[PDB]
Amino acid sequence: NGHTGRKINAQVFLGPTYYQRLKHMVDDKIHSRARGPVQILVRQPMEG
DNA sequence: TTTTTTTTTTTTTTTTTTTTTTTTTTTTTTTTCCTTTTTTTTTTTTTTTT
């Protein structure tokens, strides 16, 4: 255990694999809006 | 000389086919491309002639 130093009772499976980072970060996906631009036709909020 | 009996002519439905019309999960993120075009008429320009 990292916090206490105690042994883990169940033995665990460790080893090297090959992992891939994907392009879907959260900085390209986080979005928030309070008040902003509206459409010129229906005066509803925009897209995207 | 009138009654029944056959024929005709609409009359309403039936049934099948054809046509028409309307529909097709929710949300989100990036690029790319286009947002004219050839044809015809009009106007200006340039060269030539007397």
Side-chain angles (χ1 to χ4, degrees):
Chain A
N1 209 319
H3 313 294
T4 69
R6 195 182 162 86
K7 288 191 171 182
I8 308 299
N9 206 340
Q11 287 85 238
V12 291
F13 186 64
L14 185 141
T17 58
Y18 190 76
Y19 289 167
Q20 317 175 286
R21 194 179 183 205
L22 305 181
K23 78 168 186 180
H24 308 277
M25 283 74 74
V26 292
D27 294 332
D28 303 322
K29 289 182 174 295
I30 183 172
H31 182 63
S32 176
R33 183 172 193 269
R35 270 184 297 203
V38 291
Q39 294 177 45
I40 62 170
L41 181 61
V42 289
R43 295 188 197 173
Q44 294 183 0
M46 295 299 291
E47 301 282 321

